[PDB]
Design a protein around this nucleic acid. Structure first.
Ligand SMILES: [Cl-]
Ligand SMILES: [Cl-]
Ligand SMILES: [Mg+2]
Ligand SMILES: [Mg+2]
Ligand SMILES: [Mg+2]
Ligand SMILES: [Mg+2]
Ligand SMILES: [Mg+2]
Ligand SMILES: [Mg+2]
Ligand SMILES: [Mg+2]
Ligand code: NA
Ligand code: NA
Ligand code: NA
Ligand code: NA
Ligand code: NA
Ligand SMILES: [Sr+2]
Ligand SMILES: [Sr+2]
Ligand SMILES: [Sr+2]
Ligand SMILES: [Sr+2]
Ligand SMILES: [Sr+2]
Ligand SMILES: [Sr+2]
Ligand SMILES: [Sr+2]
Lengths: 186, 140, 160, 95, 154
RNA sequence: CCUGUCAAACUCCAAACUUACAGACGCCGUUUGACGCGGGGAUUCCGGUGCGCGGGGUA
RNA sequence: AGUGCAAGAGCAAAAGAUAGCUUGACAGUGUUCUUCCCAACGAGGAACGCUGACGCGAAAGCGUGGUCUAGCGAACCAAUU
RNA sequence: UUAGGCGGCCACAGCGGUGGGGUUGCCUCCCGUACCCAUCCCGAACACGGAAGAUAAGCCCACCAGCGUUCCGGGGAGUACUGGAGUGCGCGAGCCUCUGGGAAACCCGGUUCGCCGCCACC
């Protein structure tokens, strides 16, 4: 902008959306990337592969289309994240994808987080992904227990819209139960 | 249009720039939360050749902690027009700095897709003098 | 030292002060003469001294030609006459001399010169129609103190 | 030359034009080439490792295999055949 | 189709320039060859511009030179209408001359040596130290100019 | 703002040109066997001149 | 700017800074280039592999010393593992 | 693509500016700290949990050229420089002709306020 000699960062750098140094290291695997992302309300998992004119998404799952299988709960929590990964994973297996590397973009590797939940989901779906168990939240939290107990300290319903009062991690079970099933329309 | 444009207090930073501390204790009482050591840079003739070493302490307050402090700190000063930033910030006094900003300031403080706050959304000295003066005291 | 020694452009450009030390000061006292508080546009006549051959002009020569030229203008128009003359070139090229036979011959620094391409304006004067012949005479004296033949070219001036 | 190290006289060829300054795009550092493919050799100023001897900048060789992630590229330096070990970051497909 | 005639000897001429002439089948002074007007051939003549005389000849001129200097790929056998008819895809020199000028064939294709070994120019040429525009004999010629030369060397 | 100048160890620019690989044409090779490979024998390692480009030097 | 030291070059969610951890400044054995353009020549050097054992990281991955180009030494003999 | 995710090229995309856009949709700002996690002090950030409010930021859409950048026309310029040739000129430094190539600055007028790929989505 200042003059001829001025150096403008690559577009995805200006936009602060792509960590190019991490990306390169990610791509050195030769494997597809399990792109885990988040929004204030949603969680998205994509299986991306390298291409001539840009990346190629071979499969993916959004937390929104989770309801499409019997989900009436919010879509920005642990249970949602895990299931969203699993869904994406299952679809990945469908398209012939068998292995991946976790790309968490600009998110932090915090133990027990959602991008790690998405990973546990995608792994159970049958996808081989380099991981570390003791960095994944314990089972119960994935189910959504941490939120149930939070609702125990009631006095006023945690969820505004009525999905339930004491919430339900048991619903998480029903959904995972439904996804691991063969029938399911992917 | 105004609810998302009306100012607020991002942080109140209280700090004592000494030069070698024992003063952390008073800041912990006048503010309510733990203070932080202050290291210096570059060597200085004034027997200050040690790069990293205690030389001060500060405490950054946010939310209630910030207001509950100003309710007893502001009355201890005589704010003036010149004593204000070009961004709508002011510091008085033991130093006391007040960082004011508009709602979605996070856009420039978050990790992902962060962005610089447009000059139009940047607070102004005038818009700042108002907000504050419009709360327990006078201007110049 | 004769000019035959340096008048030709037969060596690389040697001007980098960061790699050259002990460079003698220039003998050129002024580059802008006459009433320099006034603009060249305020004059009806503009006459330049054009060099006809490419050469190097040592600072000692610029000073003498400039001197003998401005000096005439001062004598014919006064210490504050209504005119202004300019020497547009500066001696950027550093000169050497090898003053031990041809062994380690790289010369010591002895002076500076300005490179002038044929056809270029070395000097340019601005005057009124009256003092037009006085400047043409100041230039006649100036080109007698610099290597090449010169053209005394009159630019703005249709008062013939 | 006054010295004979590998980088002697490489000021220009190993310097980036100001606008191409800074970490290079990962795409070309991961590009895959097949045996028999013609590839131009050109060191990328921004990429430290995987380089070949600067003297070979501008060669158009032939990939004949790889060693780890680097490629083995055949060239003919003057009249002599040589094998160059070089990473994708310093290569470009011909045509 | 341009007619090329070497007018300056090999001594002291650049080797790459000399190899170019040889690729154009000329190995001696006064030797002439016919070259199609292609981008590839164009570079070649442009490179040998200072040691040759070239241009497009007239049908009549080409015919005169072919009759007088054309030769078989091998042998001393004369090249006349009868030879042409009994050996080429044409009925006489004219048919050949036309096909050459229109670049439909080459001397070799018709069992003829690619080279016409001309005679020194009758009455001498305009000099080999200057181009045509300066009064010399080197470089691109007029069809009338090339014809004057080729005929003087028939 | 205006106005006066520069760079072998400066460059926002930038040739001619040199150069890697390939295709085409040309030339050449498949009884004159090219290209490549192995082996025997050397001589040679004071050079000079013109032209172009130079660096040193008043030359 | 900084990055130990010449010069030129490289580097910004880093190759710089701070903090913490760590000992890959590791063992074995090669490929290639360089040394020595072309074009044979040793020591030395570099890039890139395979094997072993490790460090850190969620992981991809990074680490065959210091961002790159200087900091080097035959045979015989001795000491050492 | 009535607002999304991952990119390729890496300013034609920068700098600056104007206008427009969102009741259970999207992205956000936003609300809030029991948990996983976090601040050498701050739930600011990171992380988690969530919908009372909002389109003022961001973002997306439409657009403006003053600066920067890209390409194009006309002028500068077939100039500067230059590969090949010459019993052409010049005391000489050097120049010229023929042949084949051919800029840069700058001025004036246009272009440029990204293009493209994959996936998802009233
Ligand atoms: Cl994200
Ligand atoms: Cl190499
Ligand atoms: Mg150079
Ligand atoms: Mg014969
Ligand atoms: Mg004659
Ligand atoms: Mg001994
Ligand atoms: Mg010992
Ligand atoms: Mg608006
Ligand atoms: Mg003469
Ligand atoms: Na401290
Ligand atoms: Na001596
Ligand atoms: Na780069
Ligand atoms: Na070696
Ligand atoms: Na908005
Ligand atoms: Sr000289
Ligand atoms: Sr004179
Ligand atoms: Sr050269
Ligand atoms: Sr290194
Ligand atoms: Sr908050
Ligand atoms: Sr003389
Ligand atoms: Sr042209």
């Amino acid at each position: 902008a200042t003059g001829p000699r001025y150096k403008v960062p690559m577009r995805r750098r200006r936009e602060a959306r792509t960590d190019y140094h991490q990306r390169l290291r990610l791509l050195k695997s030769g494997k597809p990337r399990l792109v885990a992302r988040k929004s204030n309300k949603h969680v998205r998992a994509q299986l991306v592969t390298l291409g001539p004119n840009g990346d190629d998404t071979l499969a993916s799952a959004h937390s929104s289309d989770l309801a499409e299988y019997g989900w009436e709960a919010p879509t920005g929590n642990m249970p949602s994240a895990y299931l969203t990964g699993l869904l994406a994973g299952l679809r990945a297996q469908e398209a012939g994808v068998e292995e991946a590397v976790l790309d968490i973009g600009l998110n932090s590797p915090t133990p027990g987080s959602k991008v790690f939940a998405i990973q546990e989901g995608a792994i159970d779906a049958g996808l081989d992904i380099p991981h570390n168990d003791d960095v994944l939240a314990d089972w119960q939290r994935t189910r959504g227990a941490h939120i149930a107990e939070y609702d125990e300290q009631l006095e006023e319903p945690l969820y505004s819209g009525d999905f339930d009062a004491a919430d339900l991690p048991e619903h998480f079970d029903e959904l995972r139960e439904t996804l691991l099933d063969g029938d399911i329309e992917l | 249009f105004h609810e998302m444009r009306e100012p607020r207090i991002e942080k109140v930073v209280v700090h004592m720039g000494i030069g070698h501390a024992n003063a952390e204790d008073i800041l912990g009482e006048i503010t309510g939360q733990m203070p932080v050591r202050t290291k210096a840079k570059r060597t200085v003739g004034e027997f200050d050749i040690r790069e990293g070493d205690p030389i001060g302490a500060k405490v950054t307050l946010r939310d209630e902690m910030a207001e509950e402090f100003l309710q007893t700190a502001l009355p201890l000063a005589e704010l003036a027009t010149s004593q204000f930033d070009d961004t709508g910030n002011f510091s008085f006094g033991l130093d006391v700095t007040v960082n004011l900003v508009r709602p979605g300031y996070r856009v420039a403080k978050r990790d992902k897709a962060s962005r610089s706050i447009p000059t139009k959304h940047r607070l102004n000295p005038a818009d700042a003098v108002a907000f504050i003066e419009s709360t327990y005291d006078v201007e110049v | 030292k004769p000019a035959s020694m340096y008048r030709d452009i037969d060596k690389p450009a040697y001007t980098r002060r960061e790699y050259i030390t002990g460079i003698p000061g220039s003998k050129i006292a002024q580059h802008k003469m006459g009433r320099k508080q006034k603009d060249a546009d305020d004059y009806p006549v503009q006459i330049s001294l054009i060099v006809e051959e490419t050469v190097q002009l040592r600072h000692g020569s610029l000073e003498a030609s400039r001197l003998s030229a401005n000096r005439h203008l001062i004598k014919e128009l006064g210490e504050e006459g209504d005119y202004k003359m300019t020497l547009r070139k500066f001696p950027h090229q550093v000169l050497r001399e090898n003053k031990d036979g041809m062994r380690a011959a790289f010369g010591k620094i002895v002076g500076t010169a300005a490179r002038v391409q044929a056809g270029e304006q070395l000097f340019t004067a601005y005057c009124n129609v009256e003092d037009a012949e006085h400047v043409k005479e100041a230039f006649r004296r100036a080109y007698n103190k610099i290597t090449p033949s010169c053209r005394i070219d009159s630019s703005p001036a249709g008062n013939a | 030359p006054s010295s004979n190290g590998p980088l002697e006289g490489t000021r220009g060829k190993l310097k980036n034009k100001p606008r191409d300054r800074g970490t290079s795009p990962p795409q070309r550092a991961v590009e895959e080439f097949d045996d028999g493919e013609k590839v131009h050799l050109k060191i990328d100023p921004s990429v430290p490792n995987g380089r070949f001897h600067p003297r070979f900048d501008g060669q158009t060789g032939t990939v004949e295999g790889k060693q780890g992630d680097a490629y083995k590229v055949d060239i003919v330096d003057g009249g002599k055949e040589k094998t160059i070990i070089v990473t994708a970051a310093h290569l470009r497909r011909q045509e | 189709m341009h007619a090329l005639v070497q007018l300056r000897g090999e001594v002291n001429m650049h080797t790459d320039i000399q190899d170019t002439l040889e690729m154009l089948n000329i190995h001696h002074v006064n030797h002439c060859t016919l070259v199609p007007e292609t981008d590839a051939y164009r570079g070649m003549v442009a490179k040998v511009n200072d040691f040759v005389a070239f241009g497009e000849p007239s049908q009549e001129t080409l015919e005169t030179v072919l009759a007088t200097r054309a030769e078989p790929l091998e042998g001393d056998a004369d090249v006349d209408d009868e030879w042409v008819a009994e050996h080429t895809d044409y009925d006489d020199i004219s048919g050949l001359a036309f096909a050459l000028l229109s670049e439909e064939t080459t001397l070799r294709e018709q069992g003829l040596s690619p080279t016409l070994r001309l005679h020194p120019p009758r009455g001498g040429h305009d000099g080999v130290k200057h181009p045509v525009k300066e009064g010399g004999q080197l470089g691109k010629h007029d069809t009338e100019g090339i014809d004057d030369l080729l005929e003087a060397m028939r």
